Design a binder for this molecule. Structure first.
Ligand SMILES: CCCCCCCCCCCCCCCCCC(=O)OC[C@H](COP(=O)([O-])OCC[N+](C)(C)C)OC(=O)CCCCCCCCCCCCCCCCC
Ligand SMILES: CCCCCCCCCCCCCCCCCC(=O)OC[C@H](COP(=O)([O-])OCC[N+](C)(C)C)OC(=O)CCCCCCCCCCCCCCCCC
Ligand SMILES: CCCCCCCCCCCCCCCCCC(=O)OC[C@H](COP(=O)([O-])OCC[N+](C)(C)C)OC(=O)CCCCCCCCCCCCCCCCC
Ligand SMILES: CCCCCCCCCCCCCCCCCC(=O)OC[C@H](COP(=O)(O)OCCN)OC(=O)CCCCCCCCCCCCCCCCC
Ligand SMILES: CCCCCCCCCCCCCCCCCC(=O)OC[C@H](COP(=O)(O)OCCN)OC(=O)CCCCCCCCCCCCCCCCC
Ligand SMILES: CCCCCCCCCCCCCCCCCC(=O)OC[C@H](COP(=O)(O)OCCN)OC(=O)CCCCCCCCCCCCCCCCC
Ligand SMILES: CCCCCCCCCCCCCCCCCC(=O)OC[C@H](COP(=O)(O)OCCN)OC(=O)CCCCCCCCCCCCCCCCC
Ligand SMILES: CCCCCCCCCCCCCCCCCC(=O)OC[C@H](COP(=O)(O)OCCN)OC(=O)CCCCCCCCCCCCCCCCC
Ligand SMILES: CCCCCCCCCCCCCCCCCC(=O)OC[C@H](COP(=O)(O)OCCN)OC(=O)CCCCCCCCCCCCCCCCC
Ligand SMILES: CCCCCCCCCCCCCCCCCC(=O)OC[C@H](COP(=O)(O)OCCN)OC(=O)CCCCCCCCCCCCCCCCC
Ligand SMILES: CCCCCCCCCCCC(=O)OC[C@H](COP(=O)(O)OCC[N+](C)(C)C)OC(=O)CCCCCCCCCCC
Ligand SMILES: CCCCCCCCCCCC(=O)OC[C@H](COP(=O)(O)OCC[N+](C)(C)C)OC(=O)CCCCCCCCCCC
Ligand code: SF4
Lengths: 155, 318, 83, 70, 70, 175, 115, 52
């Protein structure tokens, strides 16, 4: 069947994308410290194929690690819009999930999901470096389940 | 049979470039108390495949402010000239046996800078422009010094033919009589390849991504592929110049094995150096190669023009 | 003599690279004048036969021009072989 | 450990050895089992073009020995 | 109490000046940095094999909430 | 064909001259001079001079690299001009091409064009020499004689370069 | 010939990869995505505005120093002549004048970038 | 690349911490100090502790 072959190609491109996730070098607050510890020797996100790159144009993932303020919200959407697709967003910490400790502040966006779409929510204040690494591994398994080519074939 | 020969050259180069990315990521990892890629394939042997496929099925975008023709020409020019630097290399038999191989590589190297200048200018971004003008500054720093260093080493060899460097170093390596030139040549190749501590045209910590900040997806891959193919090529050039290998006409394979190892170890040193030193300032690089190397290079050019004459050791012309 | 070995020591401390440069360049200008082997560099160049040795027409009065290449007359490269 | 870096180097090393090996074998394949002729100066080329005429098959690597003189 | 971190005078004896001249020309102190990273290459990496190996915690760890029973 | 390689390069040589002679942004003008300097290496290289071909190309790559830096500093405007941006630039570009086209068309059909000089169209290969040289390159021997024969040329050229450095410092001091 | 094929093959391969890159992937273009990158905030002024060159004097000196390789690269052939005394004298003379040229621009603050 | 004027625009991580502490008891305001200098957590607690 022709839907079997596309499913195998869909596996191939899915494998190529979850095995070469390149997060954007984008940190905001304390949650970025735990994002560095994921790159530190103990966890070494680089061994999973995850490499930080500074340019939004050379990134596949935006980890919103820290608080999002009304002054910073326009900048966050700009660097998100400039990421070539496919792009994924991982919300790290309570501040980026629903505002966290500063939910009722006049200068804090109550959740980064009000500005950009979100794929994985990592809870914690801050999440442990092992909790963020669990979130990135959940994102990879979420990319493994994509069936773009099996949906194109059935159109 | 010549088309096959070209394919037996460019295709292995790309595979070497692909797995030099893996080697760098793991070599730096262990020098940083890490492991590097060890999940995507056994010992990360499939990591280069995933990254290549990922980039070539990703969306490429032309900036609204870009000059489209220059934006697309530049990545083509970088990879096309990156592969062209290999055809005169004797390993031990070159693909294109040039009588002026040394000069051909100099001209091609200079022409390959414009892939950086035009990519940055065509991007129409301030960060791409700043990185492009660092390329102008960086090429003004080493180009004059790099030529005279080669000239001093060719005054012991005899001509500009690269195959003749194998004959020159048949009794002894050229690094013994010319280790002062070897030191200044090695640091000049780091500058020419835009490698740390002279990775200024890109400058992640200063310019985000430098000249290729706007490039994405496949077009970004060509710049990456060209940069690493240049590291290997320049380290092959260094081995041929100062670490010449003995050539047996009836066992040319033995040459390649010994010659291949010397290029890898010189290539590992580039990874070794990136993990050990901070980054220069692009004005301090100019002072390094104009106030330290250039005064000594001119003195060693006078010495190497007089030394053969005062010892009756002028090499043959042919 | 005391001052002379005080300017040299200062440059050797503040600009060692320039001290090496002028020493290497200085030796390049002097040694060729003093070297006894500079004559042989010129003799080897002459002995290299780029052109054909066009023969002369024997007019009967050229005793020092060899009739055959394997004759004792003419220039010899015995010095070069032992050099 | 550090020897888990070697497999990547081995793959890189084998790829850099092929270009040299292929050229040596292809030259011998296309030149009668001998090295490709090096003609850097016009005298060497004039002797190569002379070899084509002597060969009788329009190949400069088909050498004729003393069996061709009589 | 205090201490100066960068208040020193280099000895101007000829041997010391020559030692610094060798350092400037022969890059001695730049090769110590190479030696330091070379040693790390041969040290066992500190990377745990997550998710099969988990970083140590303590009973006081504050994770996900739960409502308990008697 | 491959017998007209020099002529084909010479046509590209002219088209690169109509590139920077139309005077677009010096960024694109410097691109035409790199193109014409590359084929110029090829034309000079097909007549027996390889050192000359690779030296002019090598020198003109250094010059244009400096000109690129100067262009972004002294000779730039908000909208750099391309060959299609001005009727003045486009008119000069089309006029140069149409003039090269008719010169090529007549020199290939009639094989004889007379403009100031009588030009022939039998192929550049008809004027080559039929006698091979010895065990050396004639151009290399001639250039190598700059240091044995051209002592007076070395002194004047050497002095000019030294005076060149002095001169530029005086001009750019200012105030 | 063999050089033309080597050059033709190298650039044809590069052009194919660029062609593949722009036609294989899925595209989603809007104005925000293609806007210039300046770290999340809109640029102030065109990137085509003048960018001062603080090393202009060294750049000019580069042209004069970049010719010396043209005059100095023939030295290996020049050493094959019978007039080594003349050739050696004029080879060192040309390099010495280059050293004087560098010395003048160095002592006169010519290698120091303008502020 | 010479700098003529640095103009640090800050406030992209201003969260109204000082205003929130007014709606919190002294115990409830303690974790707000772990998140000011989030590289020196127990030194921000100590300064607030000594003040109270
Ligand atoms: C854009 C990318 C354009 C291609 C980049 C290459 C630029 C030209 C390369 C120069 C070729 C060369 O010098 O080879 C020397 C080499 C040096 O070899 P050689 O001079 O030692 O002589 C070889 C043969 N013997 C020794 C026996 C005399 O020439 C050759 O090896 C063979 C010459 C073949 C003829 C080539 C001339 C036609 C090529 C013209 C292309 C011009 C394109 C310029 C475009 C520039 C704009 C970017
Ligand atoms: C910190 C950075 C600076 C250091 C950079 C060093 C990187 C380059 C390392 C070169 C070391 C010398 C090569 C040793 C490993 C390869 C040896 C080899 O394969 O050939 C056998 C080589 C000898 O092979 P050979 O063919 O070169 O013969 C010696 C040279 N001639 C031709 C003159 C006789 O053996 C050794 O290198 C032993 C030392
Ligand atoms: C993997 C397989 C082995 C790899 C090769 C071995 C590693 C070699 C590099 C690391 C060496 C370890 C560090 C070390 O011992 O250096 C400290 C030593 C100590 O340096 P120092 O800065 O403390 O001072 C020594 C000199 N005085 C006291 C006078 C100032 O450094 C050196 O002595 C290095 C000297 C070598 C100079 C060579 C430079 C020219 C190279 C030419 C190219 C060849
Ligand atoms: C024992 C053997 C004896 C060897 C000779 C030793 C004496 C040589 C003295 C050379 C140093 C000259 C004096 C000096 O030290 O000047 C230093 C000065 C520093 O300049 P800078 O650091 O940039 O800024 C000022 C900060 N103080 O630097 C300067 O401002 C001027 C530096 C001059 C640069 C000269 C470059 C020429 C290099 C080519 C060398 C070959 C010269 C030609 C050969 C001539 C001899 C035949
Ligand atoms: C210092 C620079 C010289 C460095 C060494 C040069 C290379 C060398 O050592 O050559 C030695 C060579 C010996 O001859 P050899 O090779 O044994 O020939 C017999 C073969 N059957 O002989 C030579 O090729 C060169 C012999 C001359 C030595 C070179 C230096 C010139 C000598 C000048 C003498 C004047 C006094 C010098 C001191 C004052 C100068 C400041
Ligand atoms: C037959 C022809 C061959 C000879 C060629 C003749 C030309 C030689 C020079 C060519 C190269 C250009 C160098 C000339 C300029 C020397 C450098 C200079 O002028 O710097 C000036 C220097 C300024 O430095 P400043 O900032 O004031 O602080 C230090 C205080 N002096 O302050 C100074 O006063 C400089 C200090 C004195 C510098 C003396 C330089 C001597 C150079 C020749 C050394 C030769 C001896 C070495 C070889 C011996 C053999 C081993
Ligand atoms: C990881 C530890 C190692 C560290 C990295 C080292 C780099 C890798 C080694 C360099 C790459 C060499 C790889 C190939 C070597 C083994 C093959 C070989 O040596 O060639 C054997 C040679 C003939 O082989 P060949 O010409 O290829 O056979 C005909 C093919 N049509 O026959 C011979 O005459 C030569 C024997
Ligand atoms: C140099 C030769 C070694 C000379 C030497 O070290 O002897 C000791 C003598 C006194 O040393 P000191 O009292 O500590 O202070 C210097 C006072 N002039 O030291 C001196 O007085 C020497 C005075 C300086 C003269 C030389 C300066 C020029 C640079 C010479 C380079 C020496 C190193 C070259 C490598 C030598 C090994 C091959
Ligand atoms: C032999 C052929 C001689 C060359 C003739 C080729 C035609 C070149 C004219 C191309 C059109 C052009 O350049 O514009 C016409 C020009 C008026 O100048 P223009 O730049 O158009 O100003 C108004 C708009 N800005 O008007 C002109 O300059 C025409 C000059 C005659
Ligand atoms: C075209 C044309 O037909 O007019 C050419 C015109 C008249 O010259 P001419 O043709 O020689 O006189 C009649 C003889 N039959 O003459 C011209 O108008 C040609 C003007 C060309 C510009 C001359 C500027 C000096 C350049 C000197 C280089 C040599 C110029 C000749 C080569 C250019 C044509 C390829
Ligand atoms: C420059 C050279 C390429 C030019 C572009 C043309 C090729 C485009 C590829 C898809 C063509 C197509 O339609 O693929 C058809 C084939 C099989 O046909 P089917 O299943 O019977 O047709 C069903 C048609 N639907 C989908 C409209 C219902 O589907 C495949 O499994 C191919 C997918 C992988 C292609 C190779 C990678
Ligand atoms: C503005 C652009 C200027 C004109 C460009 C050329 C095309 C117009 C010429 C018409 C007359 C004609 O047919 O001329 C063709 C000529 C002559 O070539 P030939 O090998 O003698 O072909 C004829 C002999 N055959 C049949 C044996 C092959 O081709 C050229 O070498 C001109 C340059 C080619 C274009 C290079 C630039 C890109
Ligand atoms: S969620 Fe917690 S650790 Fe992350 S930025 Fe907010 S307060 Fe800091």
């Amino acid at each position: 069947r022709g839907e079997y072959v596309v499913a195998k190609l869909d596996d191939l491109i899915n494998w190529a994308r979850r095995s070469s996730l390149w997060p954007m070098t984008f940190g905001l607050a304390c949650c970025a410290v735990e994002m560095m510890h994921m790159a530190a020797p103990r966890y070494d996100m680089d061994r999973f194929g995850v490499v930080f790159r500074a340019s939004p144009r050379q990134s596949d993932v935006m980890i919103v690690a820290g608080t999002l303020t009304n002054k910073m919200a326009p900048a966050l959407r700009k660097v998100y819009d400039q990421m070539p697709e496919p792009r994924y967003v991982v919300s790290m910490g309570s501040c980026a999930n629903g505002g966290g400790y500063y939910h009722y502040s006049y200068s804090v966006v109550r959740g980064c999901d009000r500005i950009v779409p979100v794929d994985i929510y990592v809870p914690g204040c801050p999440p442990t470096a092992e909790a963020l690494l669990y979130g990135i591994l959940q994102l990879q398994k979420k990319i493994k389940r994509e069936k773009r080519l099996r949906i194109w074939y059935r159109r | 049979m010549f088309m096959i020969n070209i394919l037996m050259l460019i295709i292995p180069i790309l595979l070497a470039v692909a797995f030099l990315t893996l080697v760098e990521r793991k070599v730096l990892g262990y020098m940083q108390l890490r492991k590097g890629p060890n999940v995507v394939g056994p010992y990360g042997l499939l990591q280069p495949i995933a990254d290549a496929i990922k980039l070539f099925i990703k969306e490429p975008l032309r900036p609204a402010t870009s000059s489209a023709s220059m934006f697309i020409l530049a990545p083509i020019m970088a990879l096309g000239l990156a592969l062209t630097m290999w055809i005169p290399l004797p390993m031990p038999y070159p693909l294109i046996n040039m009588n002026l191989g040394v000069l051909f590589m100099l001209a091609m190297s200079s022409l390959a800078v414009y892939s950086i200048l035009w990519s940055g200018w065509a991007s129409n971004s301030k960060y791409a422009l700043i990185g492009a003008l660092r390329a102008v500054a960086q090429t003004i720093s080493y180009e004059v010094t790099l030529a005279i260093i080669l000239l001093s080493v060719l005054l012991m060899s005899g001509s500009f033919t690269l195959s003749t460097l194998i004959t020159t170093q048949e009794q002894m390596w050229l690094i013994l009589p010319a280790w002062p030139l070897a030191m200044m040549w090695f640091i000049s190749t780091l500058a020419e390849t835009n490698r740390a501590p002279f990775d200024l045209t890109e400058g992640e910590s200063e310019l985000v991504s430098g000249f290729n900040v706007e490039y994405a997806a496949g077009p970004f891959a060509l710049f990456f592929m060209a940069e690493y193919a240049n590291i290997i090529m320049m380290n092959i050039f260094t081995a041929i110049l100062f670490l010449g290998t003995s050539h047996n006409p009836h066992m040319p394979e033995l040459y390649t094995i010994n010659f291949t190892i010397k290029s890898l170890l010189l290539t590992m040193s580039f990874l070794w150096i990136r993990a050990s030193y901070p980054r220069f300032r692009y004005d301090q690089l100019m002072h390094l190669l104009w106030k330290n190397f250039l005064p000594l290079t001119l003195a060693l050019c006078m010495w190497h023009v007089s030394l053969p004459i005062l010892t009756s050791g002028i090499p043959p012309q042919t | 003599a005391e001052r002379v070995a005080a300017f040299l020591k200062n440059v050797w401390a503040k600009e060692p690279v320039l001290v090496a440069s002028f020493a290497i360049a200085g030796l390049a200008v002097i040694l060729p004048t003093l070297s006894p082997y500079t004559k042989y560099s010129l003799m080897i160049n002459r002995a290299t036969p780029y052109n054909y040795p066009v023969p002369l027409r024997d007019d009967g009065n050229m005793p020092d021009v060899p009739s055959h290449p394997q004759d004792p007359q003419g220039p010899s490269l015995e010095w070069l072989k032992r050099l | 450990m550090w020897f888990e870096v070697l497999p990547g180097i081995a793959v890189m090393g084998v790829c850099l050895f092929i270009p040299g090996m292929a050229t040596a074998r292809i030259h011998r394949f296309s030149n009668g089992g001998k090295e490709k002729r090096v003609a850097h100066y016009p005298y060497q080329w004039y002797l190569m073009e002379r070899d084509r005429r002597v060969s009788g098959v329009n190949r400069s690597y088909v050498s004729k020995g003393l069996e061709n003189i009589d | 109490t205090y201490k100066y971190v960068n208040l020193r005078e280099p000895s101007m004896d000829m041997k010391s000046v020559t030692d610094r001249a060798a350092q400037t020309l022969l890059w001695t102190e730049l090769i110590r940095g190479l030696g330091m990273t070379l040693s790390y290459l041969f040290r066992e990496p500190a990377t745990i094999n997550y998710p099969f190996e988990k970083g140590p915690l303590s009973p006081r760890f504050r994770g996900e909430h739960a409502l308990r029973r008697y | 064909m491959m017998l007209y390689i020099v002529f084909i390069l010479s046509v590209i040589f002219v088209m690169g001259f109509v590139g920077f002679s139309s005077k677009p942004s010096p960024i694109y003008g410097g691109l035409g001079l790199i193109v014409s300097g590359g084929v110029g290496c090829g034309i000079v290289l097909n007549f027996g001079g390889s050192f000359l071909g690779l030296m002019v190309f090598l020198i003109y790559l250094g010059g244009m690299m400096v000109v690129f830096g100067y262009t972004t500093a002294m000779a730039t405007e908000q909208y750099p001009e391309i060959w299609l941006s001005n009727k003045a630039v486009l008119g000069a570009f089309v006029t140069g091409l149409l003039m090269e086209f008719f010169m090529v068309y007549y020199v290939l059909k009639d094989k004889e064009v007379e403009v100031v000089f009588e030009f022939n169209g039998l192929g550049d290969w008809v004027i080559y020499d039929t006698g091979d040289s010895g065990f050396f390159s004639e151009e290399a021997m001639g250039i190598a004689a700059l240091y044995s024969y051209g002592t007076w040329l070395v002194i004047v050229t050497g002095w000019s370069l030294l005076i060149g450095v002095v001169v530029i410092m005086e001009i750019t001091r200012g105030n | 010939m063999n050089l033309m094929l080597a050059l033709l093959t190298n650039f044809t391969l590069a052009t194919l990869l660029v062609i593949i890159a722009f036609w294989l992937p899925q595209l989603n273009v809007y104005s925000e995505k293609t806007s210039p990158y300046e770290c999340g905030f809109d640029p102030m002024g065109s990137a085509r505005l003048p960018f001062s060159m603080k090393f202009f004097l060294v750049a000019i000196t580069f042209l004069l120093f970049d010719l010396e390789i043209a005059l100095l690269l023939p030295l290996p052939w020049a050493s094959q002549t019978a007039n080594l005394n003349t050739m050696l004298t004029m080879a060192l003379f040309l390099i010495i004048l280059l050293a004087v040229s560098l010395a003048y621009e160095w002592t006169q603050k010519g290698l120091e970038w303008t502020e | 690349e010479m700098v003529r004027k640095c103009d640090p625009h800050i406030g992209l991580l201003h969260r109204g911490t000082e205003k929130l502490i007014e709606y919190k008891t002294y115990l409830q305001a303690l974790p707000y100090f772990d998140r000011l200098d989030y590289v020196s957590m127990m030194c921000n607690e100590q300064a607030y502790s000594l003040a109270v």
